[PDB]
Amino acid sequence: LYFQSMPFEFQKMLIPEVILIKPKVFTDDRGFFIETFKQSDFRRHGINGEFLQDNHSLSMKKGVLRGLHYQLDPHAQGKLVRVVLGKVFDVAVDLRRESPTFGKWVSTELSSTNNHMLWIPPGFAHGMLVLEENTHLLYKCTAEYVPESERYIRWDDPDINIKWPIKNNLLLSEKDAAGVFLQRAEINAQYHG
Amino acid sequence: PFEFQKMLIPEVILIKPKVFTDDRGFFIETFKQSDFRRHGINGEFLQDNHSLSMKKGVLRGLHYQLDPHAQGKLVRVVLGKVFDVAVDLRRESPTFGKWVSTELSSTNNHMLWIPPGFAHGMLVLEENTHLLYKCTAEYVPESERYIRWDDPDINIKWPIKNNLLLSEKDAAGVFLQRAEINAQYHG
Numbered sequence: 412l413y414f415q416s417m418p419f420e421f422q423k424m425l426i427p428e429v430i431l432i433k434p435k436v437f438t439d440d441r442g443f444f445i446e447t448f449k450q451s452d453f454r455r456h457g458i459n460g461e462f463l464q465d466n467h468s469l470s471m472k473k474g475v476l477r478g479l480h481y482q483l484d485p486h487a488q489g490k491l492v493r494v495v496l497g498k499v500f501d502v503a504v505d506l507r508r509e510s511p512t513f514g515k516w517v518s519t520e521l522s523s524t525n526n527h528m529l530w531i532p533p534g535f536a537h538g539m540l541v542l543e544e545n546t547h548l549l550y551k552c553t554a555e556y557v558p559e560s561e562r563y564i565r566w567d568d569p570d571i572n573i574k575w576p577i578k579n580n581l582l583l584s585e586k587d588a589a590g591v592f593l594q595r596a597e598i599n600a601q602y603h604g
Numbered sequence: 605p606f607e608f609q610k611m612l613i614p615e616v617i618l619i620k621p622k623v624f625t626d627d628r629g630f631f632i633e634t635f636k637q638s639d640f641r642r643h644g645i646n647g648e649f650l651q652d653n654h655s656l657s658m659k660k661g662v663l664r665g666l667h668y669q670l671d672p673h674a675q676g677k678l679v680r681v682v683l684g685k686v687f688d689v690a691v692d693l694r695r696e697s698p699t700f701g702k703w704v705s706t707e708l709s710s711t712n713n714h715m716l717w718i719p720p721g722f723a724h725g726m727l728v729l730e731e732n733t734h735l736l737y738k739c740t741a742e743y744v745p746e747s748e749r750y751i752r753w754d755d756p757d758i759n760i761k762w763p764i765k766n767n768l769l770l771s772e773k774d775a776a777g778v779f780l781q782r783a784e785i786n787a788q789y790h791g
């Protein structure tokens with residue numbers, strides 16, 4: 412019972428390079444149809460670069476946390492993130508050296524209920540906390556996977572100080588559990604504007 | 605990370621991605637330009653769509669856009685299952701009016717490449733089926749054309765013919781012999 416006239420709403424977050432996208436849901440007797448991406452519209456609202464790789468993660472239990480992740484330059488991925496089933500608390504962290512918002516973060520709830528999408532530009536790290544069982548997270552990347560370039564910052568880093576709605580149990584990968592603290596992170600991304 | 609398999613109409617390509625399981629669940633790379641372009645799948649993906657079909661027996665198709673708005677489509681099912689159909693509607697094609705089908709599901713995570721020049725149809729086999737597809741051209745409603753699912757010249761073997769939920773546009777699809785088609789065979 413939430414109505415939007417236009418096919419996409421684009422909303423800049425407090426870190427304005429991060430963009431929350433609300434697509435339009437067309438309901439009928441069959442079910443629904445959503446346009447989830449449209450280059451022409453996205454490019455007019457600041458979202459640039461060729462999407463070279465799409466990924467899909469299933470997280471079976473509430474409390475799965477993945478992040479914080481980025482690829483070193485020149486393999487930095489811009490990401491368009493959505494949840495087709497379930498719900499996540501989704502986080503973008505500005506890790507662009509010299510950025511007036513370096514080490515700051517914004518969050519949004521991405522779910523199969525809202526069908527919201529988050530644009531996380533290159534220069535940022537991504538983290539997500541699973542809030543519903545069997546959560547399917549899909550994202551498009553502006554650069555292809557380069558495992559050697561992947562870096563890992565721990566979820567509970569105190570300088571970043573993300574307010575995770577951690578309810579009870581936390582399921583972490585070994586790489587994420589072994590995430591480093593921001594102060595000893597390897598970062599080459601540079602702020603431009 | 606991907607197996608690519610040409611169908612009997614060899615421009616139609618079945619893609620089997622690799623599933624990495626762990627304690628958290630799984631990870632799949634569902635598209636990768638470098639790999640896809642090496643295996644014949646070309647064109648910029650300009651638009652992504654998502655359809656939910658609540659009941660078994662929802663049928664959508666048969667759909668294409670006239671040139672110059674023809675969409676190549678990369679089709680997958682993230683939840684549920686469809687009987688997915690590609691129909692060759694390229695004038696002068698040795699397989700004009702022929703079709704290939706595959707089962708796309710959340711169990712197999714298979715994907716189908718349906719090149720421009722083809723029509724797409726899908727029949728929903730599990731409740732709450734989520735079909736996702738990437739298009740090589742943006743939506744142009746004026747260019748959309750609709751061919752009846754049960755057209756007798758195309759003669760698709762749909763695994764269900766009865767409890768069928770159709771859109772009004774699909775119900776009103778035209779028969780192949782009176783279809784508007786401008787796509788041309790080059791291959």
Ligand SMILES: Cc1cn([C@H]2C[C@H](O)[C@@H](COP(=O)(O)OP(=O)(O)O)O2)c(=O)[nH]c1=O
Pocket residue numbers: 514515516517518570571572573574
């Ligand atoms: C709420 C919020 C905090 N933050 C950062 C700013 C601060 O470093 C920290 C806020 O938590 P806290 O240290 O408790 O607040 P304060 O610094 O105002 O005493 O987290 C964000 O980057 N984004 C947000 O949305």
Ligand SMILES: Cc1cn([C@H]2C[C@H](O)[C@@H](COP(=O)(O)OP(=O)(O)O)O2)c(=O)[nH]c1=O
Pocket residue numbers: 466468477478480556584624631632633
């Ligand atoms: C991020 C990523 C991972 N993988 C593989 C490597 C591992 O086997 C598995 C999980 O990787 P992992 O780095 O744990 O993913 P997450 O970002 O969710 O923590 O997926 C790819 O094949 N491609 C990708 O782009």
Ligand SMILES: Cc1cn([C@H]2C[C@H](O)[C@@H](COP(=O)(O)OP(=O)(O)O)O2)c(=O)[nH]c1=O
Pocket residue numbers: 701702703704705757758759760
């Ligand atoms: C089985 C199959 C049939 N077809 C075509 C061939 C026929 O024109 C029609 C099915 O008819 P069919 O009963 O297979 O052959 P016939 O009628 O010649 O005895 O659909 C395809 O295009 N793809 C397929 O995978």
Ligand SMILES: Cc1cn([C@H]2C[C@H](O)[C@@H](COP(=O)(O)OP(=O)(O)O)O2)c(=O)[nH]c1=O
Pocket residue numbers: 437444445446653655664665667743771773
């Ligand atoms: C195919 C398509 C449909 N729509 C809208 C128009 C209708 O309100 C709704 C369903 O269109 P419809 O043509 O019935 O979809 P399907 O191909 O599944 O039969 O979605 C778009 O906004 N973009 C698209 O690319």
